Copies of this chain bind each other. A is one copy, B any other.
Amino acid sequence: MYELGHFIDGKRVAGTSGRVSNIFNPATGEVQGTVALASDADLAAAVESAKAAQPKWAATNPQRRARVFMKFVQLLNDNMNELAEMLSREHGKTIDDAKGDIVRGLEVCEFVIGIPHLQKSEFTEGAGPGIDMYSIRQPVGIGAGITPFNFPGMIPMWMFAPAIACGNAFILKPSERDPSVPIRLAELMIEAGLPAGILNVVNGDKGAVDAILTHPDIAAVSFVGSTPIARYVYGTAAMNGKRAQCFGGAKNHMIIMPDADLDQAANALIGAGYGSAGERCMAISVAVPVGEETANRLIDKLVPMVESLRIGPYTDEKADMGPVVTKEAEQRIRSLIDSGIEQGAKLVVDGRDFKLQGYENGHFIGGCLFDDVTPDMDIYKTEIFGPVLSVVRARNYEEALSLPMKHEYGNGVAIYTRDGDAARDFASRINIGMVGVNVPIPVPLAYHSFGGWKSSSFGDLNQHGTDSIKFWTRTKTITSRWPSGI
């Protein structure tokens, strides 16, 4: 029965705020402890801490900065299990899923070890008569990052690694569903040799977010979450003159061509759709088999795989997928499911009544699969963020491609085929950020960049990779000339 506060200046720290938010264990439904919710006062403190520390960290040379991360990765590996447990205990996802989650953040840390090279600027000589021209990439000062429940390990790291490594000081306002991991991360960071103040964790709600966007000393805000909040966070951030990147929702389609490997496809779909209980910005929502036989045979492969999915709490190491995050979330899922039924879709596998003995209060829904889904339906238009697979049947390639093309969401997409032509055209044309050819969850590695299109992002630079070093950095340009002395 724990109380989590903030982490400001190198210490776990309770707020001055009266307010406190309670953390559930989603597998039992029960309250497990609480999160300090920051007040404007608490937030102002965080910035001050950041302000004081940042000049000197800026002044630490790139190689030294990177060695902090090299120790941080070592530390992370060391705490693989302990970090993975608190994460699974608060979020619901299997231990393996949490480890995967943390491994992915680690990988951006590995990437940022290369900051000395990643941060070099361009030089030119003889731009004029005796005139040299060169740029420098300097810190932006202080930055804030806002994080969702879905990844309370990987997405903070995604942002604070490149921001910190760049010489910035960073403030993380994470989700108050699972706030344990972000705080452990800040602690290990100092244990790795980060100065106090450089990475602060502040917990809270809309108040805290709003305090971040209005706060004059924070230059850059980074957001991942839902599209209506992202649109808000982006806009509000821009009004207060900050730079901003925001990443929102998804309704990700997997097109299956008649010539694809249906077995690989089927297996990919089962993992991509139901893994982590569908609770993912990069999960496959909608399968689009092309043609009647492909759609019949795909279904036939998939329903016994869905029915046999193993559902349990994180303490059950055999479980394929766990409980969803909250009772709010479970019910929203349940509502969508029944509307799928009301609108004429065929629920070929019905996980509505699954009940796990000794865990009745836990937020458990068995996996669900819909067939004959069409674009009018809400199960189509809406991101469900729950264990629900929609099969939409396409007559052909052109018809198939229209579906992801025309959806307001454009985060990830996958086409499954042997035909190079089919793949190149599709991956070429589709108005989506991240395209998987015979790959289901096409999330780029740390040294590339992640970002959707259309309604799934806002701004002009992605997350991690080369783009991130642009976001956390501002460019000085120097024009240099000399008169004769000696």
Listed in ascending order, the chain A residues whose CB lies under 8 Å from chain B are 59, 61-63, 66-67, 70, 73-74, 107, 110-111, 113-114, 116-138, 220, 231, 234-235, 237-239, 241, 243-245, 257-261, 264, 397, 417-425, 427-428, 430, 432-439, 442-451, 453, 455, 458-462, 465-467, 470-471, 474-486
Contact = CB atoms under 8 A, between A and B. Distances in A.
Contact of A125 (B128, B136, B420): B136
A486 B132 CA distance: 23
Contacts of A124: 62, 116, 119-121, 445, 447-448
Nearest to A129: B61
A399 B23 CA distance: 53
Given A460-B243, A460-B459, A477-B442, A123 B125 contact: no
A127 B63 contact: yes
Question: Quick one: which of A397, A453, A483 has the most chain B CB within 10 A?
Answer: A483
A421 B474 contact: no
A476 B453 contact: yes
A253 to B, nearest CB: 15
Nearest to A140: B460
Question: Quick one: which of A120, A132, A261, A478 has the most chain B CB within 10 A?
Answer: A478
Contacts of A261: 483
Given A470-B461, A479-B442, A423 B422 contact: no
Contacts of A450: 477
Given A113-B114, A459-B243, A126 B62 contact: yes
A130 B422 CA distance: 12
Given A122-B122, A476-B433, A424 B114 contact: no
A478 B475 CA distance: 21
Contact of A477 (B74, B397, B435, B482): B435
Contacts of A461: 460-461, 470
Contacts of A241: 231, 234-235, 455, 458
Nearest to A424: B482
Nearest to A128: B61
A154 to B, nearest CB: 15
Contact of A476 (B120, B420, B432): B432
Contact of A439 (B234, B475, B479): B479
A486 B123 contact: no
A457 to B, nearest CB: 8
Given A135-B449, A460-B459, A113 B113 contact: yes
Nearest to A137: B125
Given A70-B74, A127-B448, A423-B480, 10 more contacts: A63-B445, A116-B124, A116-B127, A122-B122, A125-B137, A241-B455, A243-B459, A259-B486, A435-B477, A453-B474
A438 B117 contact: no
A209 to B, nearest CB: 16
Nearest to A265: B483
Contacts of A120: 122-124, 447
Given A113-B113, A241-B231, A420 B482 contact: yes
A134 B111 CA distance: 17
A309 to B, nearest CB: 24
Nearest to A472: B460
Nearest to A264: B483
B110 A111 contact: no
Given A448-B122, A459-B243, A421 B61 contact: no
B239 A235 contact: yes
B125 A428 contact: yes
A432 B123 CA distance: 18
A264 B484 CA distance: 11
B448 A420 contact: no
